Every structure is written in C-alpha cells, then in structure tokens.
Amino acid sequence: LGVLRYTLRARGHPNVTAGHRTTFEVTVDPEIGETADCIIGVSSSDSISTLPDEMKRAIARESLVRVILRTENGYDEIRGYGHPELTLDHPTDIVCRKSDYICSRTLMIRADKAAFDLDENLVRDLRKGRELKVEIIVEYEGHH
C-alpha cells in the first residue's frame, strides 16, 4: 500500500448552501448561481485535471480516497473510494459522490457524506466567503 496527499485551495461564496444530498463540489469558477446547492468552494487552485499525475493514477484503480475540508472555524472528513474508470479530466470541477455514478469530474464514489452532511461551522465560514483548504488522501495498492 502507498499513501499520497495533496492540498488545494478554494474559497466560500455567499450563495453556498451545501444542501445537495448525494454530492459536494469544488470549482475553479469564481462565481456560482443561487441553485448550485452542491458547490462548497469556488476559485479553486485546482480542477480535477490539474491534480498530480501520480495521484490521478493512484485514484483510478480497483483505492481509498479521503477528503478533509477545513476553514478557520470548520472541519469535516469524507471517506470514499476510487474506481478504475475515473478519468479525472474535467477542466474546472472536482466532485465527490455517494453513488457509483462516474463522470470526468468525479474524484470519489460511494462517499459517506454529501454537501448535506457537512459541518455547520464549515458551511457558516463558506457562506461568509472565507478560505477553504481541501486535502485529498489516497491509499492504494501499487500494482493494478
């Protein structure tokens, strides 16, 4: 087993509600609409496509993916799984899902938490447009 870590940055937005029941998302886009209830971070310093190639290779295989979200007064941890069919090539977004549905934005499937489940302190900071630190931890088998 190997373990890889990576941290990216983003910020909250006044329109963040984090009410989505099956996913949560971070985007490089700077603005979000009033109906984007799955977005918890904007102006991300990374899209799923810009993550390190070594990490993208580790995630896309038969692997565990964990995300830790942090703001000055908020914190939460989400645990999910990778999958051999994840392409991690969307140019602007990073999405974590509770289902096993896969698209180019998907970083994790069968997650234990969606936006809906996130820490209230975290959402409060995000709604104030505060900085968000996103850490991705992948534990995987070297040969696949």
Side-chain angles (χ1 to χ4, degrees), residues 1-33 35-144:
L1 292 173
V3 181
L4 286 165
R5 285 178 182 265
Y6 185 73
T7 299
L8 60 86
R9 295 177 166 289
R11 66 184 189 187
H13 189 284
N15 292 331
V16 168
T17 59
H20 201 94
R21 297 161 186 291
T22 65
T23 73
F24 69 79
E25 175 195 328
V26 169
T27 184
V28 299
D29 293 334
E31 297 294 311
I32 57 174
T35 61
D37 68 329
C38 77
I39 297 177
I40 60 170
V42 297
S43 291
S44 178
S45 60
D46 277 298
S47 61
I48 191 166
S49 68
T50 60
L51 298 182
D53 295 320
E54 211 195 326
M55 175 172 268
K56 295 197 290 188
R57 293 194 292 274
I59 290 170
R61 59 183 59 183
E62 296 70 22
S63 62
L64 301 170
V65 182
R66 178 170 40 136
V67 164
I68 304 178
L69 305 171
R70 297 184 176 90
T71 56
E72 61 173 353
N73 312 296
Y75 171 100
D76 217 333
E77 184 184 304
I78 305 85
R79 297 167 165 295
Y81 306 88
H83 188 290
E85 285 176 288
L86 296 177
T87 48
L88 303 101
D89 55 331
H90 192 78
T92 70
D93 316 320
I94 299 180
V95 176
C96 292
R97 310 171 182 288
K98 290 190 64 187
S99 71
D100 83 319
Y101 174 80
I102 294 176
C103 70
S104 60
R105 307 164 223 234
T106 307
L107 176 78
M108 170 204 298
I109 58 168
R110 289 188 284 118
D112 60 352
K113 299 183 178 183
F116 173 79
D117 306 295
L118 299 181
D119 178 47
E120 63 157 45
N121 272 34
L122 193 85
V123 175
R124 283 169 174 163
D125 290 329
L126 296 174
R127 285 178 178 171
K128 293 186 182 187
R130 296 176 174 171
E131 297 93 319
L132 170 66
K133 287 291 262 60
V134 180
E135 179 178 33
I136 306 171
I137 308 165
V138 191
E139 186 161 47
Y140 58 100
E141 271 294 318
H143 312 300
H144 79 309

